[model samples]
Target: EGLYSRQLYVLGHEAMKRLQTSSVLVSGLRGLGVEIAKNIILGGVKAVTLHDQGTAQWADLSSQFYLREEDIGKNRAEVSQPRLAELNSYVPVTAYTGPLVEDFLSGFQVVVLTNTPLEDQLRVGEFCHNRGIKLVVADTRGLFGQLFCDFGEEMILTDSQPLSAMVSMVTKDNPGVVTCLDEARHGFESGDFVSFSEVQGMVELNGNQPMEIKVLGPYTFSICDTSNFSDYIRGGIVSQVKVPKKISFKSLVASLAEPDFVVTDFFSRPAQLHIGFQALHQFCAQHGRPPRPRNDEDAAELVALAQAVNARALPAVQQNNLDEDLIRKLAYVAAGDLAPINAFIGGLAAQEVMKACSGKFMPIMQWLYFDALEC
Candidate 1:
């Protein structure tokens, strides 16, 4: 298949049929936005507002379109518009030689931001949140990939399965960049950062004591915006006992304030469970279940094992049959599968855009994190 496959072009064709019915705004012409826009246009995203400020930087030469020394001194969005149009003669790519504005953002159905500064990332997220627009941030940095999605207050998730599913869709047939370890592994250290296995070493350096941590998952996941699925799956060595599942907190969760209960920082570290072991024992004893399981696949044996542990901890729980969904949500958070975790995060971002354009998928607010190397 050529760089733009006919089959893929047909997908864009179908997507354009929808665009013909709607509208979209693609922010920034550099970084992952370039790839996302290229794919969206190829998939039929016809009407788009391209926003970029100032002159193009040299680093953008490798990733963005229409960049040369002459173009360097020109406004990136202005130079990029003609080139994007040249690449796809059909679509209407509007050039905005300016920074992202609240008014401009309010006009589009979906907004995609890439290669923006961290401060801007959070700021744009808040703007979209307040305006009821879906904001998607894609990043391809330091051989890592991630996508941060902020959907105003309405998005909600019942399970982690769909997160991975949507990730497959957004990244299915897009341009990819692959960097090997030999050329990239200098300052990196290998350790599990999910549900908490070998992550203690890193946490310790940050003044975290191991015994204070509550829950730990043995897995890894892509951060969403920065990398592709293949790189996500290629995580070094995921343990069979601790598979990561993409799950989200139903409420604004907080660990016990006392460090003795569960070091809040550890839980905050990966945004995954980092509860105290004693607290878990007491909870299992009181509830008659170990913890909730995130993925459907972890339902059978994991659930049974949790029940047994709960029975041993406190016979009272076994008698009450506490809310199953509650336990399940807890376990799902505990499982913290990196693949699904990262996948869902990416999905959350995509779904945010979808809902902004089509008003589908429930909105959600969550703290999500994962590492690609610990698989």
Candidate 2:
């Protein structure tokens, strides 16, 4: 009972209920992958199956955290299975060392692809897409990190959250005074912000972000100035607008050519790294490994590779000026695997999965990129 008592408050009754019955498949047991595995287990899912045919090595011990020197040569998934099972008693934890074929993935509801090859990601995306399974793919390329989510459609849920209050009257005065239909007093605090919709006449307020509303009385508030806009019309909805975001994600193969990136810091430069990450994938596809730390030649090769993809991209998002210096840093940290980077990406990815499982919040459209290279 106490296992999820703390998490219960945050997730709520229905979300927690839905999460308990959800099953997941987490493949590739590296640092980022293990971070994801541990988080979902902590979420107390129905079942968790870790799959990895790869074995651990000297460098892996530093990051994976689940690997010990004595179990260095063992199958990565098998070595960590019992330990992960210990994290939660109710949820069953099992390890599998097999290909991620459809027959194998049929049992899980959410499929997490962390640190796997691009081909496998696209393949898994295909499998999940056809069967209506939720898919989330996360990876780190040294300085750069990428996250993907396709939770079908983030539909509108019609659950009453105490309805706040309904609009009674909107005064056409210089500063609009909006009064609520006092079937009861407006249950709003003084500083609370509310928005409007479906309002006739005062059309300016309908299609807008949440506007600040200062309560004038139990049934009244001021919505700033409305003198310049249209007159107050009848029939409008006033409530706390929570913003509905609907996004459809493309498969891994399709998104490669035409990508939609979630911009964290700046809007313009994500394109540079979007192409850079794809080119890095291409580099691994050809060379069978990531570039070394600060290898000038490899960085240049990767930068050159980015242009070819730029050539193939549609003119809309194509970079007229590719950020070569940024691309080089991405290449420089190609072999970099820091705990913080994995934790950041994994934490974000974990939340997306919870949203996917619980259908509570809006998930990322397709891609989210981050870099922590600069001191």
Candidate 3:
């Protein structure tokens, strides 16, 4: 009972048209990065420049859900490009087989950041901002996860709240007259103290507000005053929490900093980050997911087309309790519709990029983190 018995309606026709027309960049070939590519290709992006330096390995097999056996021994991006293209014929996929190149990235319409290092994330963030292009980033570290999309200059002006969507909603439902973020002057007034006329006048005068809003935190600081990279960005919404088990940054740096970590290395953290990553993979398996890759060859083949790097640059599992922001932004259509939370978060991140590429919706800029300690 496929489409033949039902409607043969086009699935991603409009989205395909949009994807066939825009250029985009993607970073990372791990858990979230692979998911982002799947969603972007489905949306019909014109071309994607995928960058990742890691080769096929067993560790990637579990988290990398799209790889195949034939892909073993190939670089991550090399393997993923063709496989993803096979999913859609019209879109061209360009697999860049090494570290990120500055020149190629400058021309893309939107940049997607997932499973990349913080420095690279920020570098790309600054780059996109300087060039006036859109940038979207999403990730889950330890038990926390979040996503954000920036629309260049508009971010500084609109306060990053998807103002366009809000306006559209108000207009379609409220109809006629003047209403917006400015002045709060018109339309419907519900409260007793304020008159509808006063509200209307206030609304009309409330000009455009800044688009950069707090993601997980309303991190307070003069963006100009902070010298530490993590400080200025980790304020407001992120809360400080201590790990129950004793762990230190030195230990983590020792583990992942090596050229090749044993599969056991990712699981032996004194803290919860590595533990959770492994736990969830096991969880997915118990819930009916295919077995994650075990040995190097098996894992490589599974993620053959993904962008898996040695993660040499990523800090190892450490217990710094540094203000790593970990608050979940409540999403209605986001986390509400999926299973085994990590996959859902990954899929939702991918969808946001699709929306941005389609130019149909302004992406979410506020970082979202949800606490599961209570659960």
Candidate 4:
């Protein structure tokens, strides 16, 4: 009631109490893990246990805030504990000096694992899921970052808008292009899902089947197929479809590296970068290691993987979308971590941690992949 006045005014007493009592385990105290641990600690978690057995290295200075030049040979967990504990006097922080084992993960309410090997991350994530624990697996390489949240159950989403409009015009030459009946603006994003019904000329578009939407003009849009203009020669009804926001971790991982994809607009999906990174993981999974730097054979393998994945992607995904130079850069830094990117990801992952612990706000659906170069 004393020092907690400001925070409690917003978070309320219940949420503050839950955060003050919840325990979090952060594995791999590197670039990403350090920021995650710091934010969670600052958020007033009851306890934070850092787990990392490796000693500091020269490259560690680039991102790890808790490490110093003198601490090169010191264990990461041991070096980061004192600094983290100093952040909040009320929160007790500890360090575990060793590789993470499943048995040790049983106690923590939420587990944040970052900067670990891809295979190891997946292994630990699967373990945490089976135990009904909330797991946040995050990775940062160069200017790209990816985070996945697993709540161990189904999660429904909110804030999706639905709208309906009448068809004004349908092109006879290209039936796929249809215009709304009115001059009113249809406030819909390019990636939004829509369905059409109650049409006179477009009989095939009836029956309320969902279709992809691409806004061409203020009152014009295109569907998947445009060839059949003979039937859709007149007016029709279009309505936005409700899409589920929830996705399971299992399903996400399974489809993470798949080739099939959906297109919305230019620089909209960030598919190329994501596909490249996923291909790297697949390469590591198949070869048991990341692509070697400047190795012809390794480059060939990684490129081949990316091409094969892109080959199976949707027709809208043009060949130029897959940047060869970016793929090469990703291959080089595939096994490395960066500071700015990790910190950015840490902040996001920490917010999800709070939501998971308090069961208050909506958590991330399943996967969030970011590219600094693009929006």
Top candidate (TM-score) = 2
286 Cα displacement, candidate 4 (Å): 8.4
- List the global CA lDDT of all models: 0.42, 0.74, 0.43, 0.69
Q: Estimate each model's TM-score.
A: 0.43, 0.74, 0.48, 0.63
lDDT for each residue of candidate 1 in 1-375, tens digit (9 for 90 to 100) = 111122233333544443353456767676455555655555455466778775787756665645776777777778777766765555678888666768777877567775455446556666666665656665432222344445445553211111011111112112221122331222111221211122221222122111111122222122213222222332221111112223322211111111111122123322212122223334545556444544554444344554554444432123334334433444444423233333333444444444345432233333322334453
Query: How far in Å is the alpha carbon of 84 misplaced in model 3?
Result: 0.6
> For candidate 3, lDDT tens digit of each residue in 27-82?
77665677778767766677777767777565555565666666667787777777
How many pairs of residues collide in each model? 34, 0, 42, 4
Minimal lDDT window, size 10, model 2: 1-10
Q: lDDT by residue for model 4 over 23-84, one digit each (tens)?
A: 88988888788898898877777788999978887877789887989989898888999999
Specify the poorest-scoring 10-residue window by lDDT in model 4: 1-10
The weakest ten consecutive residues by lDDT in model 1 span 161-170
**Candidate 3: minimum summed lDDT over ten consecutive residues — where?**
234-243
* Candidate that would win on lDDT: 2
- Residue 59 in model 1: lDDT: 57
**lDDT order of candidates, best first?**
2, 4, 3, 1
Q: Which stretches in model 2 have alpha-carbon errors above 4 Å? A: 1-19, 154-240, 243-247, 264-266, 373-375
